[PDB]
């Protein structure tokens, strides 16, 4: 059933699984109209579908045209997410199809279950983890490809860059969640930590800077400090 702290190593076993996060699928800016009413304007979004073992990220870009003339967009967005995840599964060869799909928000369970009726052996699971995948649009290259899209588009990334050459998927996922938690809590300070030093660059084929093992430990410490900090600035402790 639900994924939580007790069954956390399951994420890194050899059963193919995907996390699905819909928090950036339907995105809007809220503004005033000439008459002084409020209106929304959609901007491009994305489904964040991640294999936590391999790092493979299936970034389905949701172009604003998919909302045109549609009602109840927040509810449609869950079903559009489910439709696209289902289409992704069918596009994969059988031996690449997930055995489990974990949704980060419980509201996705029925839409995805209904879209996946053709796959009765694929388990659709919620999670009690508060995962920070909403902050994926704080990763500059992901944000850039979403905003530039002029049509629906799937873009494939490895969200771990080359880290798995040197660390395990458990450690890589922990690093990712720490970076994303930091970026979610204080994006400016997080990005300052990541880029302050111009001698460390991001490879054209990567998302994150080319830190050595020792530099990653410094970075990881800075990000914890930042999280605990903000947690102080927030609560006054």
């Amino acid at each position: 059933g639900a994924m939580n702290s007790s069954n956390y190593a399951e994420l890194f076993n050899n059963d193919i699984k995907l996390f699905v996060d819909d928090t950036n699928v339907y995105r809007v800016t809220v503004h005033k109209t000439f008459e002084g009413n409020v209106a929304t304007k959609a901007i491009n979004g994305c489904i964040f579908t991640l294999n936590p073992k391999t790092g493979h990220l299936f970034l389905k870009i949701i172009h604003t045209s998919v909302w045109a003339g549609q009602k109840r967009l927040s509810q449609l967005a869950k079903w559009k997410t489910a439709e696209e995840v289902s289409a992704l599964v069918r596009s994969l060869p059988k031996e690449e199809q997930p055995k489990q799909i974990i949704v980060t928000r419980k509201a996705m369970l029925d839409p995805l279950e209904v879209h996946m009726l053709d796959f009765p052996n694929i388990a659709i699971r919620p999670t009690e983890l508060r995962l920070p995948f909403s902050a994926a649009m704080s990763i500059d290259k992901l944000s850039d490809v979403v905003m530039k899209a002029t049509e629906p588009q799937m873009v494939l990334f490895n969200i771990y860059d080359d880290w798995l050459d040197r660390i395990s998927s458990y450690t890589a996922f922990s690093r990712l969640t720490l970076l994303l938690r930091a970026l979610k809590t204080n994006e400016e300070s997080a990005k300052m930590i990541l880029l302050s030093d111009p001698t460390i660059t991001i490879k054209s084929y990567h998302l994150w800077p080319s830190f050595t093992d020792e530099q990653w430990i410094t970075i990881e410490s800075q990000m914890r400090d930042l999280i605990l900090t903000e947690y102080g600035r927030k609560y006054n402790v």
Binding site: L76, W79, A82, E83, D110, P111, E113, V114, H115, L117, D118
Partner: protein, 300 residues
């Protein structure tokens, strides 16, 4: 007016006949029930004084044969059986009527309750839900499971209600996932009404029979079925107006008849709040909403 005679009453038992019930003491001289209205199905049911485990009973229609009850001391229950010898059976009953050892089916003339609860129920359909073709009558009890329950174990003792499952390929057209899940009208009208039941009368018949098995036997799977058939209509944006009007009457009399003390277990809060307050038909069940609010305001 027809009669279901009893050979004897060897064990103390509460006997029900439709919505009526009376206590029979151990070896009390009881020889059955007379003046049973022709034109309706009926259910005669039993709860033993010594073991309230297993309410059980028989659905029957007196137009289809002469039925009586004999206590079987080996299997330990009151059994319905069908006598073929008309003259022998009538003669005994005739004679039994003379010694006044029968209770009278106690219908108040003003009262349409039973008709209203069984309006669409037909023995022929009961016998397809309850499969035992050598008998004209149908046995049901507390513990019998439904076909759907078994999918999630003895097939011959099952209640073969129509399987309804909102997250199934039957309910959901490929490519209309969201449409069909939020508006079940396709599933109600094409799959179930046109496809499986053929008309709304058979649908209501099964719905009413499910309710009655839930109420009289505490049959939990029947209660599941009754609520599913309600929820399928309420969750459909497009329902014939005559069905909605009839549904309101059906449910009104079911809510009216339900023992007040059994509401906690027989009534699904989620389904009812959804149907009366959130569903497409939230405004189409005036009588049912009024009786539910005055009688079970807690549930809501």
């Amino acid at each position: 007016m027809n009669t279901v005679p009893f050979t004897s009453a060897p064990i103390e038992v509460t006997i029900g006949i439709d919505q009526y019930s009376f206590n029979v003491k151990e070896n009390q001289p009881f020889h059955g029930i007379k003046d049973i209205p022709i034109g309706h199905v009926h259910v005669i049911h039993f709860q033993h004084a010594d073991n309230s485990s297993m309410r059980y009973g028989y659905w029957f229609d007196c137009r289809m044969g002469n039925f009586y009850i004999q206590y079987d001391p080996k299997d330990g229950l009151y059994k319905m059986m069908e006598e073929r010898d008309g003259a022998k059976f009538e003669n005994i009953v005739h004679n039994f009527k003379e010694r006044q050892m029968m209770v009278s089916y106690p219908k108040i003339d003003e009262d349409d309750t039973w008709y209203n609860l069984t309006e669409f129920v037909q023995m022929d359909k009961i016998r397809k839900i309850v499969r035992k073709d050598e008998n004209q009558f149908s046995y049901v009890d507390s513990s019998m499971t439904t076909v759907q329950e078994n999918e999630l174990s003895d097939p011959a003792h099952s209640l073969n209600y129509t399987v309804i499952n909102f997250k199934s390929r039957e309910a959901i057209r490929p490519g209309h996932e969201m449409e069909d899940f939020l508006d079940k009208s396709y599933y109600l009208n094409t799959v179930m009404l046109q496809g499986i039941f053929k008309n709304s009368s058979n649908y209501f018949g099964e719905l009413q029979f499910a309710f009655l098995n839930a109420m009289f036997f505490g049959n939990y799977g029947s209660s599941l079925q009754w609520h599913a058939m309600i929820e399928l209509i309420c969750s459909s944006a497009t329902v014939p107006k005559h069905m909605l009007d009839k549904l309101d009457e059906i449910l009104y009399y079911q809510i009216k008849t339900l023992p007040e003390q059994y509401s906690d277990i027989l009534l699904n809060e989620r389904v009812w709040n959804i149907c009366l307050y959130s569903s497409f038909q939230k405004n189409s069940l005036h009588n049912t909403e009024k009786i539910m609010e005055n009688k079970y305001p807690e549930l809501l």
